Design an enzyme around this catalytic site. Sequence first.
Site, PDB file in Angstrom:
ATOM      1  N   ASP A  26       1.994   2.533   3.384  1.00  0.00           N
ATOM      2  CA  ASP A  26       1.575   3.892   3.198  1.00  0.00           C
ATOM      3  C   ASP A  26       1.152   4.567   4.641  1.00  0.00           C
ATOM      4  OD1 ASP A  26      -0.947   5.442   1.728  1.00  0.00           O
ATOM      5  OD2 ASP A  26      -1.727   4.662   3.588  1.00  0.00           O
ATOM      6  N   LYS A  27       0.787   3.898   5.383  1.00  0.00           N
ATOM      7  CA  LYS A  27       0.294   4.756   6.793  1.00  0.00           C
ATOM      8  C   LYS A  27       1.734   5.269   7.388  1.00  0.00           C
ATOM      9  CE  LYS A  27      -3.105   1.006   7.774  1.00  0.00           C
ATOM     10  NZ  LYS A  27      -4.147   2.009   7.520  1.00  0.00           N
TER      11      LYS A  27
ATOM     12  N   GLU B 291      -1.545  -7.923   1.784  1.00  0.00           N
ATOM     13  CA  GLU B 291      -1.180  -6.711   1.744  1.00  0.00           C
ATOM     14  C   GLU B 291      -0.139  -6.158   2.804  1.00  0.00           C
ATOM     15  OE1 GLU B 291      -3.378  -2.231   2.275  1.00  0.00           O
ATOM     16  OE2 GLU B 291      -3.738  -3.664   3.217  1.00  0.00           O
TER      17      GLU B 291
ATOM     18  N   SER C 166      -6.925   4.658  -1.096  1.00  0.00           N
ATOM     19  CA  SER C 166      -6.973   3.295  -1.069  1.00  0.00           C
ATOM     20  C   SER C 166      -8.224   2.598  -1.402  1.00  0.00           C
ATOM     21  CB  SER C 166      -6.590   2.974   0.362  1.00  0.00           C
ATOM     22  OG  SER C 166      -5.548   3.709   1.026  1.00  0.00           O
TER      23      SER C 166
ATOM     24  N   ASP D 224       0.799  -1.204   0.050  1.00  0.00           N
ATOM     25  CA  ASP D 224      -0.004   0.141  -0.008  1.00  0.00           C
ATOM     26  C   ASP D 224       0.874   1.155   0.057  1.00  0.00           C
ATOM     27  OD1 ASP D 224      -2.090   2.131   0.656  1.00  0.00           O
ATOM     28  OD2 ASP D 224      -3.272   0.479   0.957  1.00  0.00           O
TER      29      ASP D 224
ATOM     30  N   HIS E  61       2.270   8.284   5.401  1.00  0.00           N
ATOM     31  CA  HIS E  61       1.621   9.632   5.797  1.00  0.00           C
ATOM     32  C   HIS E  61       2.221  10.226   7.131  1.00  0.00           C
ATOM     33  CE1 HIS E  61      -2.032   9.369   3.344  1.00  0.00           C
ATOM     34  NE2 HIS E  61      -2.218   8.101   3.471  1.00  0.00           N
TER      35      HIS E  61
ATOM     36  N   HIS F  83      -1.010  11.212  -0.763  1.00  0.00           N
ATOM     37  CA  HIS F  83      -0.417  10.143  -1.926  1.00  0.00           C
ATOM     38  C   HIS F  83      -0.189  11.193  -3.214  1.00  0.00           C
ATOM     39  CE1 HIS F  83      -3.798   7.492  -0.296  1.00  0.00           C
ATOM     40  NE2 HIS F  83      -2.906   7.752   0.603  1.00  0.00           N
TER      41      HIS F  83
ATOM     42  N   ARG G 266     -16.065   3.937   2.639  1.00  0.00           N
ATOM     43  CA  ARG G 266     -15.060   3.101   3.592  1.00  0.00           C
ATOM     44  C   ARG G 266     -15.083   3.223   4.838  1.00  0.00           C
ATOM     45  NH1 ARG G 266      -8.930   5.330   2.048  1.00  0.00           N
ATOM     46  NH2 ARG G 266      -8.654   3.958   3.783  1.00  0.00           N
TER      47      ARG G 266
ATOM     48  N   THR H  88      -8.145  -1.803   1.601  1.00  0.00           N
ATOM     49  CA  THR H  88      -7.777  -2.639   0.787  1.00  0.00           C
ATOM     50  C   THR H  88      -8.119  -3.964   0.892  1.00  0.00           C
ATOM     51  OG1 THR H  88      -5.482  -1.274   0.874  1.00  0.00           O
ATOM     52  CG2 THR H  88      -5.239  -3.401  -0.118  1.00  0.00           C
TER      53      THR H  88
ATOM     54  N   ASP I  70     -10.226  -2.163   6.984  1.00  0.00           N
ATOM     55  CA  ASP I  70      -9.564  -0.948   6.130  1.00  0.00           C
ATOM     56  C   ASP I  70      -9.679  -1.363   4.677  1.00  0.00           C
ATOM     57  OD1 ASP I  70      -5.972   0.471   5.922  1.00  0.00           O
ATOM     58  OD2 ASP I  70      -7.927   1.353   5.807  1.00  0.00           O
TER      59      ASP I  70
ATOM     60  N   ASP J 125      -1.309   0.219  -4.816  1.00  0.00           N
ATOM     61  CA  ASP J 125      -2.494   0.928  -5.066  1.00  0.00           C
ATOM     62  C   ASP J 125      -2.377   2.325  -5.872  1.00  0.00           C
ATOM     63  OD1 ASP J 125      -3.673   1.815  -1.899  1.00  0.00           O
ATOM     64  OD2 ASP J 125      -1.744   1.720  -2.564  1.00  0.00           O
ATOM     65  N   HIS J 126      -1.320   2.929  -5.335  1.00  0.00           N
ATOM     66  CA  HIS J 126      -1.141   4.439  -5.761  1.00  0.00           C
ATOM     67  C   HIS J 126       0.125   4.817  -5.073  1.00  0.00           C
ATOM     68  CE1 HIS J 126      -1.570   5.353  -1.543  1.00  0.00           C
ATOM     69  NE2 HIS J 126      -2.730   4.552  -1.491  1.00  0.00           N
TER      70      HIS J 126
HETATM   71 MG   LIG Z   1      -4.352  -0.532   2.633  1.00  0.00          MG
HETATM   72 ZN   LIG Z   2      -3.590   3.044  -0.168  1.00  0.00          ZN
HETATM   73 ZN   LIG Z   3      -2.789   6.505   2.333  1.00  0.00          ZN
END
Ligand SMILES: [Mg+2]
Ligand SMILES: [Zn+2]
Ligand SMILES: [Zn+2]
Lengths: 444, 444
Positions: A322-323, A317, A97, A46, A326, A407, A161, A150, A148, A364-365
């Site tokens: 990702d987290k 995943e 996500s 992620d 951030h 992102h 979400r 994903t 979450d 995912d991005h």
């Molecule tokens: Mg995720």
């Molecule tokens: Zn993501």
């Molecule tokens: Zn994110």
Amino acid sequence: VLENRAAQGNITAPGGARRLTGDQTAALRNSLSDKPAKNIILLIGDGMGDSEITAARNYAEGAGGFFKGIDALPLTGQYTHYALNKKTGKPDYVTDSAASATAWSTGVKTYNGALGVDIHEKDHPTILEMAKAAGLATGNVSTAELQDATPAALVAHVTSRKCYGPSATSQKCPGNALEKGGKGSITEQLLNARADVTLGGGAKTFAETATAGEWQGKTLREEAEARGYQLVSDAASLNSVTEANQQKPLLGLFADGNMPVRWLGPKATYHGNIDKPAVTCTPNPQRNDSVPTLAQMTDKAIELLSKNEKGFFLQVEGASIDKQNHAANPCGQIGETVDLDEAVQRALEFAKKEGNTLVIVTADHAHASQIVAPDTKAPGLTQALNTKDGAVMVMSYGNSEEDSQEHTGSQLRIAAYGPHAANVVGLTDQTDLFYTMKAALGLK
Amino acid sequence: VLENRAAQGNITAPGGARRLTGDQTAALRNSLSDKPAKNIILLIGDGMGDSEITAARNYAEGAGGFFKGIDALPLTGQYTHYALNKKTGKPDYVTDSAASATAWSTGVKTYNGALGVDIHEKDHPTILEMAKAAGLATGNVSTAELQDATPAALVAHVTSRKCYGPSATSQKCPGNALEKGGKGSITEQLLNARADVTLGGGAKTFAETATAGEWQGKTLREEAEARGYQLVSDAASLNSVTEANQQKPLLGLFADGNMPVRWLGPKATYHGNIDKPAVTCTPNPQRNDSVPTLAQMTDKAIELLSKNEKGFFLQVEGASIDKQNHAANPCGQIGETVDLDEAVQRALEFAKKEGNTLVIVTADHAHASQIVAPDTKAPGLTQALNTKDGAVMVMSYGNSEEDSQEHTGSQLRIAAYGPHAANVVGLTDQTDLFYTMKAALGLK
Ligand SMILES: [Mg+2]
Ligand SMILES: [Zn+2]
Ligand SMILES: [Zn+2]
Ligand SMILES: [Mg+2]
Ligand SMILES: [Zn+2]
Ligand SMILES: [Zn+2]
């Protein structure tokens, strides 16, 4: 098609930094197969764009090193993951996500925040649902809360979400609320989906009680048990599981929320590369040995799922890359990428041995982190790190003045190995992945 | 190995965003040839990482669109371009334009600022010098000054990229200074190299006079004439040239410094996406009609160079993508990316017809620009743009508080078409590119 892509020798000498040991044409030609895949393992890092992969390799393996898992997939390409503006239907260049996961599991673009539904809020079947319908075994593993985006995209169809359990769904997704005649919250839809193997965090939402239907009044955990699910909560008990199928599906909840990250390191700060000493990451003191790693969950799932003769579909995943991105935490971010690499190695080892397995590794991005020069004077958050090469690498997060870094919309790497992997080469879209997996499995 | 990679239909509908129209295994197989390449055309988008490619596509063709040149190369991969610290010989994670150019043209990693020399300041032959020696025609085209790092790397061996002409070399590269027994400045070495076709900007330095040798006292422009070079300075005169070879080499000087940019737009600013209105790029009014475009120079070069029966090596550079990225000017940067796509189209059109031509499109290193959400409040420089989709795209430059945005170390896309294009797939190093070209041509 090489298994070793590390620098050949002395990186300061002619030819020493080369990763190729010879011509690839013949090898690559041999790795191209259009025979159907029996199984599919989709690994998602992620927020793991090319920048994240490079930073993690530089740190852990050195510039000239190579991830034995992540960098070993022979067929590569770059794919687009833009979302859609719900109102206008026009592209939204930077996806979240939820919309991205919905794209590869459904084959239809959607708006940021949507799970399993298109811009009209109409439901579409996910690849997991279809696989299950064809009789294949199904698995869903993640280091994040199972609610979450994903992992949830594979089993839930929700307009927001944020609709984790009954209480949030009644408020935020009234049309999906069980009382109101909807399919239910994310967790309820997860329980209904009944994948053979489901492992991750997010135990706290299972404490909520259903507001309607058959298991009304009983917490979501009680309903899981009443429905025949085997629940495990640590490494020891997961290990003791010997089978998982439609009769006895496995559900592992290893944390209240997200599972703890592997590495500890300070947060990047303004002028951190110039006013702060270079950092060396260390293991996270708060992560317990009883908490299974991503590679352990992956290995266990492959073992239980591989017992199905028709085949299996598994999504894995590495959620926290990702987290931590951030959070502007280089050590947390890199450790989560190393963790994912281990899981990819487990997947590849199985695929090579089995021979009819399509393994895909992508994200995912894209995200915020950038690798910049040591003396860089940046407006954002920076940090100097001591790498495996014994040199300093500086990472920068400069796209947000808020607490969370954002992102980015850059196309990013997608790599695969096995039957039908050629469909990942060149430029493709995230929605093509859905079609690639559907055709490989003949899931049509 | 498809030529069309645009979204297939309604991007809001199931499968409407797909870029693939079918399985590409068979197509890819046929794309794989290890027969020898007669010609090689290397196109470099300076500072053109995946982010830059995505931003320009989003703007010019729409998120679901595709560059008919840039996105049409079938074999794709990601490559590393880290430089080396001159002192320690350890990797320097973020390379400059000189060290990277030296890596693909020489096959050896070097320190930032070096041209054609390793960290010991020992020079190595370039792929262009090797092509000449083998009897092949050679071309070097760029939109920057011909002394700039990318084009200069092919013909010069100097300890500092700042050694443009006689004067600068005397103080910055004394060991290379002609009057001290050195091979000379970048311009003198370019004149000595005698490639068949050399087109670009940088006429300023030809106004300098040599300080020693057979042409001391004469400007470098006079020396070129004295040595048999055909000098052209506008599109009409370039068009008149009917042949360029070792007795009649072509030297085009279309500007004093760098050639003018194609598009105009304001520079990104602090909170520019939220304070200022979305911009729409326009053509550069101050750009003279008689200045040839990169595609025109590329086209003319291919025409002259293809007269050689042995084959040709041609390097083409869209130099200002990087320069506008440094300047935090989205319209300048995107316009220069669109400009390179046109040149790539001419290259691909020739290659498909000819059939024994290896075309490669890549960048020397990654850069600063990032695609962020419209409502992003960033610490750096931002700007909102009106894309072809009629949607707003925000670009961010947030890695420097100085006047110039910085390069980044992320691995990036390399794409190829033609004989030996398979050596670009998977993870490789920028130095592998040198060997890939050397082998494809049989120059070994
Ligand atoms: Mg995720
Ligand atoms: Zn993501
Ligand atoms: Zn994110
Ligand atoms: Mg350049
Ligand atoms: Zn450059
Ligand atoms: Zn630059």
